[PDB]
Design a protein around this ligand. Structure first.
Ligand SMILES: CCN1CCN(c2nc(Nc3ccccc3)n3ncc(C#N)c3n2)CC1
Length: 328
């Protein structure tokens, strides 16, 4: 068995009105109300464009979905709606469809984002602490709302560096947390998939997002994106092993009576643990202080139960300057 150490009973105490998303009746707005201005991206699940709200003439983001199941789409909507107003949670503005094909589009707020590939390398020590902090506020909030994002990665963190505004986007994999429930482990992106997913542990929780966050954090301070560069689910676990070491992996597996798949256990092999400092270099030295290391260390743990919760992370001393600045 395995349950979240915090916010475990959020959905238990809330009525079906909150988490029974398959009972959602979508209210569609007017598509014409939003016009395309330029494509900003694409993914396996949609095509994204910078749009404009003809009425108020305000900038927006138009996400044109590719064929998806009604269940999956009512889940993203129900969740978006559930989290609206939360700290740094992207706001869902409208939901429309194409009469002819029924193709749906989710209209979100616009964020003048700067590609992480280019943005992150310019971030200062303080910028990093600041943005991670903002992102943590979003995670604690949704976790406190009985929700797991399940796909934390740079690509889903929009940042308007100019205005230092951050938003956690793409809640297309998010789920409501139910104690003991077994979820699909086919979530998140490879480079940010936690061990629980890599070893099929299905009764995972909010903590999976913290491993992802840790991956993002390590890449940022060590200036190595992505930090864990594997090519398939099995090789992802091998890269993780060559760093944290296999003893930790074994104890983890043993604690959860989990048996690895033969071929997989074959690839992993046996690896000593590599100190976090073995990743320091002239390119990232101005970013790897002990606090940054202590913090990273408490995020990237095999046992998801051992990882810091979002609330705990926000209070780590690494963020003290950000906290002191805010409380002013
Ligand atoms: C990172 C990959 N991809 C990029 C496009 N996309 C995307 N892009 C933006 N902003 C943006 C504006 C100008 C240039 C680039 C981005 N936003 N802003 C809000 C959301 C929302 N909701 C969103 N999604 C979705 C994610």
């Amino acid at each position: 068995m395995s349950k979240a150490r915090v916010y475990a009973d959020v959905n238990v105490l809330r009525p079906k009105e909150y988490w029974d998303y398959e009972a959602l009746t979508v209210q569609w707005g007017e598509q014409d109300d939003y016009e395309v201005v330029r494509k900003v991206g694409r993914g396996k699940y949609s095509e994204v464009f910078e749009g404009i709200n003809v009425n108020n003439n305000e900038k927006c983001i138009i996400k044109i979905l590719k064929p998806v199941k009604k269940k999956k789409i009512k889940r993203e909507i129900k969740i978006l709606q559930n989290l609206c107003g939360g700290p740094n949670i992207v706001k869902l503005l409208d939901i429309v469809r194409d009469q002819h094909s029924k193709t749906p589009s989710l209209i979100f707020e616009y964020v003048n984002n700067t590609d992480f590939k280019v943005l992150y390398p310019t971030l200062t020590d303080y910028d990093i602490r600041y943005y991670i902090y903002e992102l943590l506020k979003a995670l604690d909030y949704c976790h406190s709302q009985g929700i797991m994002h399940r796909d934390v990665k740079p690509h889903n963190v929009m940042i308007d560096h100019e205005l230092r505004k951050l938003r956690l986007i793409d809640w297309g994999l998010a789920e409501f947390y139910h104690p003991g429930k077994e979820y699909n482990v086919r979530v998140a992106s490879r480079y940010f998939k936690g061990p629980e997913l890599l070893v099929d542990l299905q009764d995972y929780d909010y903590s999976l997002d913290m491993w992802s966050l840790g991956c993002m954090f390590a890449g940022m301070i060590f200036r190595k994106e992505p930090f864990f560069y594997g090519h398939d689910n099995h090789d992802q676990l091998v890269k993780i092993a060559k760093v944290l070491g296999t003893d930790g992996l074994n104890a983890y597996l043993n604690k959860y009576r989990i048996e690895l798949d033969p071929q997989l256990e074959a690839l992993v092999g046996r690896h000593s643990r590599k100190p976090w400092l073995k990743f320091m270099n002239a390119d990232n030295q101005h970013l790897v202080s002990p606090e940054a290391i202590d913090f990273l260390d408490k995020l990237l743990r095999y046992d998801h139960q051992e990882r810091l919760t979002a609330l705990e992370a926000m209070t780590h001393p690494y963020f003290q300057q950000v906290r002191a600045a805010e409380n002013s």
